[PDB]
Amino acid sequence: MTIAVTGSIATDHLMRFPGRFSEQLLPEHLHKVSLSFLVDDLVMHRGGVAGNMAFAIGVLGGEVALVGAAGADFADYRDWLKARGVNCDHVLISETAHTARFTCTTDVDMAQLASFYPGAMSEARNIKLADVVSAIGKPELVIIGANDPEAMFLHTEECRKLGLAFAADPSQQLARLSGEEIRRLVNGAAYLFTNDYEWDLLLSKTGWSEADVMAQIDLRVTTLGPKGVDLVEPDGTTIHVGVVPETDPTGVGDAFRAGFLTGRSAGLGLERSAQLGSLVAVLVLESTGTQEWQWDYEAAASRLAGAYGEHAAAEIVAVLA
Amino acid sequence: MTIAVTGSIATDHLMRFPGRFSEQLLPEHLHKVSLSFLVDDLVMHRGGVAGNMAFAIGVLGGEVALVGAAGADFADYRDWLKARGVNCDHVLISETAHTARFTCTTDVDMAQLASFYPGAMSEARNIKLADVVSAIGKPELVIIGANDPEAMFLHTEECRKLGLAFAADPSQQLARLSGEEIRRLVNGAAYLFTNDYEWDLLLSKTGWSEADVMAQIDLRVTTLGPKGVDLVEPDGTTIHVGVVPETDPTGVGDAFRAGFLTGRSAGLGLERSAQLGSLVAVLVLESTGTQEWQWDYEAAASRLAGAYGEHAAAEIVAVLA
Numbered sequence A, B: 001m002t003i004a005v006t007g008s009i010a011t012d013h014l015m016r017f018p019g020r021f022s023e024q025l026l027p028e029h030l031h032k033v034s035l036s037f038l039v040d041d042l043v044m045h046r047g048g049v050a051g052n053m054a055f056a057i058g059v060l061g062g063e064v065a066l067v068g069a070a071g072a073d074f075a076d077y078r079d080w081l082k083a084r085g086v087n088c089d090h091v092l093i094s095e096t097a098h099t100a101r102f103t104c105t106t107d108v109d110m111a112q113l114a115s116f117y118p119g120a121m122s123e124a125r126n127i128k129l130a131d132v133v134s135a136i137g138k139p140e141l142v143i144i145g146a147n148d149p150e151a152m153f154l155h156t157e158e159c160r161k162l163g164l165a166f167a168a169d170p171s172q173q174l175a176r177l178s179g180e181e182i183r184r185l186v187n188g189a190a191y192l193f194t195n196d197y198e199w200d201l202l203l204s205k206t207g208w209s210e211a212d213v214m215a216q217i218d219l220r221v222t223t224l225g226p227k228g229v230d231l232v233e234p235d236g237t238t239i240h241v242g243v244v245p246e247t248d249p250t251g252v253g254d255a256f257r258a259g260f261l262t263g264r265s266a267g268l269g270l271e272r273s274a275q276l277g278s279l280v281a282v283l284v285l286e287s288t289g290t291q292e293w294q295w296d297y298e299a300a301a302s303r304l305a306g307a308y309g310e311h312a313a314a315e316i317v318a319v320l321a
Ligand SMILES: C#Cc1cn([C@@H]2O[C@H](CO)[C@@H](O)[C@H]2O)c2ncnc(N)c12
Pocket: A008, A009, A010, A011, A012, A046, A047, A048, A049, A052, A101, A102, A114, A115, A116, A146, A147, A148, A172, A250, A251, A253, A254, B036, B037
């Protein structure tokens, strides 16, 4: 039932370059760069990893508290989440620093070009998850969402000190972190999320075998883009699940992990809960921006059934009923 | 006396990556890019080419009307300019579109990485400069500042149809425009501004000799970064002027062209007015952001004199007195 989404809160300002990035990269002097793109659209959208997720879990119908640091501009955002059932009492409002900001430009192809201002996100090292357990008691899961580095350890350290289930989700910081640090985020993980490119990367940097990784966690999940995802237990069960058929980029990843874990945390099986991830990923990918999408019992039904069976569908919709 | 600054109005959101861009460019796949930088600062600053300039001319003490298109968010900006002596009556407020936005990230070295959302800037093609001449009468100079492309021609076309002095300033659109188009922005120019890199570029694209360029304009100016600028008449007079010694990036270029043309348009000589450009360029380069700098008679004096002579100084300060 109750999962607390520990991670980042941002506003996300996104643009679109209707040409192609390469065609300016190709001739440019890549040591003293002077890059400039003419964009034809600009959106501001509520974002952040821990907030795309909270909203997902909440809209899906489950219990979620948001644990992430933030600024004072954060009243519009807070009331936004609290209105759908997110419990924002545990967000840390900064005294000196604005809510983190994510700026991204995407092109026709669509390569990504981006900056990240952390703002108050760095203070998420000053939060104790105890004071949470106090307020609402000991959650079923603390998700260690991509965040401020030191927070991410502390929030992983503190789960282990309190016997709390966590779900490693280190996507963003694999690139930026060591083998040692990375492994110190993946010990006792009740879950581990990654794409396979990252999971390779992970294996190189950490120096572990796939095996002893699997000793230490209880369930690797690994999303494969247009293929699907591979959920895989230490006992080799390797349930595979394809996608609802796309036909956006940002958010999707966190959106799979939201439906999956809400579908999990309403008693559904690995597979069904994975089928539910795939539905919410694609609800995003078809929505203006990340978190201006609509949950609909009817829609989901008559669509969960196209990609998986009518057997498949009924159950997820039962449990979300 | 009265110059009307025709050009772009923007807000300018600037960040700083304390590492180096190259070090991510170097290994990346430059056809399907996935670039991301961790910035440690973020500012929002009033910007736009025609507005950095208007503010310059005005703070310097002269008459300037702002001619550029804009959105409805533009009341704070307008009152900002009108409070120092800018005449904003001729700005076109959009019905459908936000004030243009300039997003830039700069690193230690400092290569530039940037996007440009034009917003209401494209409507600057719907403005007639006649309706200006009506309101305040026929200005001494219309500056064709980097703007919406079709506007830029129209505002150059319309000057020629009305016997108005203009100052080609095409910096940004050389890259993006043809030889033909470029030349159709430089015929009868009372002034032509460029850096020398661009002026080379210009010569290639237009296919002209330095000579017949000089037939058609009345004065090429060409800024040389840490060197200076070369003002040069068709009769070869080639007065050279070094810089006040730096010891920011954006804005500077427009800031030279502001002090120069205000120093001009208070009767000063090519050289003195060029010495005054160099002062305001560097006032920017030493100011938090573009247009949070202070004009000071004392300061300028006791500083115009360090780089040029005490002869030099007194005169500019007399005329700005
Ligand atoms: C760089 C990147 C970031 C984007 N995000 C958030 O990722 C969400 C999509 O997964 C976006 O809304 C962005 O705010 C980050 N969160 C924490 N640390 C980060 N460095 C980022």
